[PDB]
Amino acid sequence: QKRAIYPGTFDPITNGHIDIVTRATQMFDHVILAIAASPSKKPMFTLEERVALAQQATAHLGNVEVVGFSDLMANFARNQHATVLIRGLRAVADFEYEMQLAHMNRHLMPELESVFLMPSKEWSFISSSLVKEVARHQGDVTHFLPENVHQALMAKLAVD
Amino acid sequence: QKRAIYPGTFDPITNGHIDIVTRATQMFDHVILAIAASPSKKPMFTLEERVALAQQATAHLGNVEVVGFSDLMANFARNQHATVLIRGLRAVADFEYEMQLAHMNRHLMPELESVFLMPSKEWSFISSSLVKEVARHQGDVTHFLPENVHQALMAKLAVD
């Protein structure tokens, strides 16, 4: 009965995040998609919007639970009885930062294992920040997002 | 009749940028040096100052046109009838970011080819941000800039 957490800002959730969480569900019994409540930089979408969007986009995956959190991801994993922390590794990931984070998470909770998954080649060169920057500048990002996220991002930028 | 765009903030234009745009003119019939009107971080020089400086520094290159833009660089390339997008690759470039940008630009305009040029070893370890940071801290940056840019940067920091 292995429980895994998949933390992030998911601002908004992309097809790359869907690809990662789907691979995680095929490996672990229970996956908690954990959304950061209060990131350093103010998010485009509120925590409620981000939770609602991730819930709709993962509804077809029976063993995914979407939950918000504001504490250390290691503390959150300990409270969720999770022994696995999922991180996606795109071709464009900051590997140096992943090593720092994993070694720090191990110092905080040694029994918590950081697991790196690789997304499809299709999502290996995108990020939520690149998608948003393109969208803010009127670029087509439909291909990178679930339908519900595309509709919400269009509505957000219409009134900005 | 190949048309190439060379986009950037050019805040201010450096000898590294001059080196890149010169190599581009030797390869393509028409080069548009495209200056970003409204970057995320407020620039040191206004768009008019940046355009005027780049115009003076490239005047000796007959097939360079200096133009400001505020849209997506792929949209700007499509409107300029350009099929080539020039990016300089210094030894200190963020290659991971270049891959993201190139793959995103290809998604937005598939017929637009991203072309990476390498500057002289002399300019392979500098950037406008490093030059400005050194200049703000009273360091000698004459070697890295065209004469007109050096005079304008001295005048800017005199009144800051």
Next chain:
Amino acid sequence: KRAIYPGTFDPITNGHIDIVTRATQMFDHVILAIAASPSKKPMFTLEERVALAQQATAHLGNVEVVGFSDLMANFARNQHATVLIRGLRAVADFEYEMQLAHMNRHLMPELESVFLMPSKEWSFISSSLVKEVARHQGDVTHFLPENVHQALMAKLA
């Protein structure tokens, strides 16, 4: 859940032991798979490498050590493994790791490549570096299981 941990393991080091131990804490059964790897011209034969890894992992009840000369994705299919473990130390290896994982996915899409990070203690060593040091009579006891250390001493003697 069955996971495979493939490699040349020429010889198996404390870094490899660290990885396979983390894998056993996550998956029900772990197959430590030793590739014949003749193109790399290994120091130890496949039988020596299998015997050494068996002795070094004996204390881990859910590890099975097996040799193979097959394509690793075919070997993973034949072992009924849906997880392929790879250890990650630094950025340089991460690139070849991406190629291998994308190729393994093309050959077997249901086989998931997972990357584990070793202890800081083993983050700067490799079988190649240990062998190079041992060839120049340097002390490598700290980096190897005891049985591997004695076999490497005997091999270079």
Next chain:
Amino acid sequence: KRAIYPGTFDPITNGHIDIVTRATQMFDHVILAIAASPSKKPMFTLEERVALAQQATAHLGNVEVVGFSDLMANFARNQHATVLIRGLRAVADFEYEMQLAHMNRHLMPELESVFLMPSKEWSFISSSLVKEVARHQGDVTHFLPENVHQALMAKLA
């Protein structure tokens, strides 16, 4: 404008076809230049590599396939090329690419090295990886032109 696209092309892959196709859309004439490369001990002879690349690029009207054993900058001068094309997949290759481009510039300053990025589809493959998979009887049809796939099958048979 004449551009040269040099390499070992042992064998030519879909990633190489992707690069040379992008080059033809930018330059009037493209020379796909196959280096003898004896130090790498190639799987296919230079004649086989030339024949394979010729058949695989026949549909591209402005590609000329030529073999060479010369210094690539001397070969580019002799082909009246002012552009040298190199494909870029990841960071690790980008370093050796910088050395090669700065050396080529020292030897021929008027020859410009340009870097093109392949499709995401071919961003994780290489001739070496394809050959390694094919040696272990793995399916590599997806990564190669048909004629190259059959020649690689015949070579390993």
Next chain:
Amino acid sequence: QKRAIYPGTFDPITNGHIDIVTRATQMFDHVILAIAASPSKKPMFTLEERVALAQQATAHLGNVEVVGFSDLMANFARNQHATVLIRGLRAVADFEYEMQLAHMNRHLMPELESVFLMPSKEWSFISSSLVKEVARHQGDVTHFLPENVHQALMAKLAVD
């Protein structure tokens, strides 16, 4: 009689910084641990707090002088009669940035040599920014700091 400067923000000084400065004292006759007075991002600790903390943490090292500075690190090295500039290289260091900085420092003061030291494996994956981010989020960072720094960081976060 070689004099070396070891510059940084030291916000706060960590065991990684102590490891680096200790290695520097074993190599050079006089080491100046140089604390940046006015960094770009506002520091957690004031310059006086940072100086006091670094002084207490290096007191056992007889040939270390802790000094604040607000000018270019190359100008500061020239004024301190230092011909060596120490930079720590952790496994997670931004090497591209280190190359830019070293080449710029060499342009400003060619006789000033940039020297890269490697910390213990124990401190190879941490930074002051990661330690602070973990501490702000109630994580245990005792292991990464000198005792006096741990007490000061606890007091800082108690009133924040």
Next chain:
Amino acid sequence: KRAIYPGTFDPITNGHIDIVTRATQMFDHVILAIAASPSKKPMFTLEERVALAQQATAHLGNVEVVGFSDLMANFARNQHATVLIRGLRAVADFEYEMQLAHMNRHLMPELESVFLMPSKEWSFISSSLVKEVARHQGDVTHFLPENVHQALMAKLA
């Protein structure tokens, strides 16, 4: 203070001269240590490499050129060196450099590895690239001391 600058120096280049010159401005005595390196199958014998480096560094009064086949940490101990110099050009080398430095520290904790950065002029060359260019009759005079250039010409003749 005694510093050792070890390497294969096959042959010694202007980049190596740049590094050793910076080292002499920092330390009282510098030992340029040439590793036999038989596994790399060097172009020049150890005696040729020692003779060439001696002639190329003669103008630097505090450089001693010595050959060794020993573990570099044992050689540094025997030379009474507490500093080990390594030149740093780019990120790719920085990883192997970290492994080597952490291993050298394990073998000799009082021996400090220091990294120096060469001039921008030599930041894109290596002995391997210079030899490869010279093998194809390319001009490499700019990258080598005069005596090394003539010896490399004579070796390839």
